[PDB]
Design a protein around this ligand. Sequence first.
Ligand code: NA
Length: 240
Amino acid sequence: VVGGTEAQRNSWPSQISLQYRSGSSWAHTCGGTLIRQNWVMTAAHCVDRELTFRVVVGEHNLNQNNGTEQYVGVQKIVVHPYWNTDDVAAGYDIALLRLAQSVTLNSYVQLGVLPRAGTILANNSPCYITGWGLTRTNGQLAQTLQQAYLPTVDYAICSSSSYWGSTVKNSMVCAGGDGVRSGCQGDSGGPLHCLVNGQYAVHGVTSFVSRLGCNVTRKPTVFTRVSAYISWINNVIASN
Ligand code: NA
């Protein structure tokens, strides 16, 4: 997250860190959202590589013991069947991870609530992106979980020529684009939390930013629109 602030450690208890085994250690690669005690929602592109993955819930500082973490292996990966790694702009950038164990819920570990199917945010709706991704274009991962306020940019604007044009689809949500605050590498897969009727819900799964940089004016961060995938999510969970 470029232009973020440190999150309070109990603000975003559905946020997870998706990590891969790297030699004798683990490395953060993506975010995700805990949606059941044994299921995480992330981006498909985050699990393209043939790596050994784990999820960390209750994480705040990637580099220090928080005293709240639970570490769990990923047992099964279900990528959306229409995902094409050659074509992030086509959409379908969503995957579900079944965890090897069910995590225990507490103030640091909670299920993300998802929007009702079909919900579309009004332009300029209030949302926060969260994650441990790069804090500058071509920078380094955050240590501590970051948040940035990224109001939505509706489809009509986002898909206009000076924004993303044809690359953004109605199955996506755009947010930000002010040139200061954005998602960045390492935030992919994590949530966009939007305040609706008094309650934050996870409306987006971070999918992509510009190839020209993270915080680029009129290139808002692009998210998979969770409300387009409710039936898919429920079908996967019911059949696994
Ligand atoms: Na930690």
